[PDB]
Amino acid sequence: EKAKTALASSVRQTHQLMINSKQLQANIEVQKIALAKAQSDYNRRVPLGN
Amino acid sequence: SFNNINASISSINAYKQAVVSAQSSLDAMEAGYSVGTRTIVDVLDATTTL
């Protein structure tokens, strides 16, 4: 029974890492959006300078 | 009368400079609108000043 409980705990823990992956993917999405905003802003400003 | 003629000359020079400044501002405002950084109220206000 002790061994079975240990296996259950390990299987549960491995799932916590498989979800942290999705969390970090969402963070990447946020960063992509910010970069897109900056790029759009600069492309808007470039012609004026010329 | 002589002094008045001289004053008129100076005023003409001042007004020409003002016209050039207003034209530059209008061009800036129009370019900003073309790239999408400004509304059309700004364009109309610049036109009025010119």
Among A42, A41, A44, A39, smallest CA distance to B31 is for: A44
Main-chain dihedrals φ then ψ at residue B38, nearest 5 degrees: -145, 155
Solved with: cryo-EM
A49 by Cβ neighbours in 10 Å (0-12 / 13-18 / 19+) ranks as exposed
Which chain B residues in 19-48 lie under 8 Å from chain A, judged by CB atoms? 28, 31-32, 34-37
Min Cα–Cα distance to chain B from A46, Å: 9
Token pair, residue B21, equals 């400044």
Question: Least CA distance to B33: which residue of chain A?
Answer: A44
